[PDB]
């Protein structure tokens, strides 16, 4: 009721599926036991058109994110002025009047670190969507889910043996054949050995 990869063409050394798709065997076992997705196809025209419109969109999104972050800065500044009103208006200690300010600065540091970490996650997912290409693995499930529900067009990505069947479906032996013939013609070194 769902396809299956033969174990002889996967697990034996060298992995014949691994050579036929130029995937490492670690990647192959990560795909065909549903541990990590694979981008089986991608678009180009919708990719570059909505790359323009969506780089504008993610700039808008990062602008709203920075609005949230400096709103958190304003809230921390107001709470720090409350720490001022509770530390240097009544009778307070020498260093306990400043430990509340240092704790407020600690709160701001972790708050901007949280906003920075989701900023880096959004930047990472945009970098991934720009560098999207077939035969690419995507580990870290949550990143794949965010990538799918943001940009569910422009690419298809499955997981496991049906994705492998789709990959062999979208694979010219003649294109890879002439590519490797040219590489063994021109190349050298480790690239020559792997290409052979």
């Amino acid at each position: 009721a769902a396809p299956v990869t033969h174990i002889w063409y996967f697990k034996g050394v060298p992995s014949r599926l691994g050579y036929l798709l130029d995937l490492a065997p670690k990647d192959l076992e990560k795909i065909i036991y549903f541990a990590a997705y694979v981008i089986t196809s991608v678009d180009e025209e919708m990719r570059h058109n909505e790359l323009s419109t969506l780089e504008a969109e993610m700039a808008v999104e990062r602008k709203a994110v920075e609005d949230q972050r400096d709103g958190e800065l304003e809230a921390r500044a107001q709470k720090l002025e409350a720490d001022l009103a509770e530390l240097e208006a009544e009778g307070a200690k020498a260093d306990a009047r400043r430990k509340v300010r240092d704790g407020g600065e600690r709160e701001m540091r972790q708050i901007r670190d949280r906003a920075q970490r989701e900023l880096d996650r959004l930047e990472d997912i945009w970098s991934t969507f720009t560098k999207l290409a077939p035969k690419q693995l995507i580990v870290d499930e949550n990143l794949y889910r965010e990538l799918v529900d943001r940009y569910g067009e422009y690419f298809t990505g499955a997981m496991g043996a049906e994705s492998i069947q789709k990959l062999i479906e979208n694979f010219d032996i003649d294109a890879e054949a002439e590519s490797l013939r040219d590489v063994i013609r021109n190349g050298k070194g480790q690239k020559k050995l792997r290409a052979l």
Binding site: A1, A2, V4, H6, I7, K11, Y33, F34, G160, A161
Partner: protein
Amino acid sequence: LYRRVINRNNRLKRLIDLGAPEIIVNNEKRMLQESVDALFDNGRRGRPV
């Protein structure tokens, strides 16, 4: 081994007929894949059946 493969395949077909969340279906398909691996060469990939 044939009984294992027949069992897991029929259960997977039932699960897709039922409509199941992604985790259960993926776990079932991985179980089916490991069953066919055990059938063609047991003890090859990891723990022998």
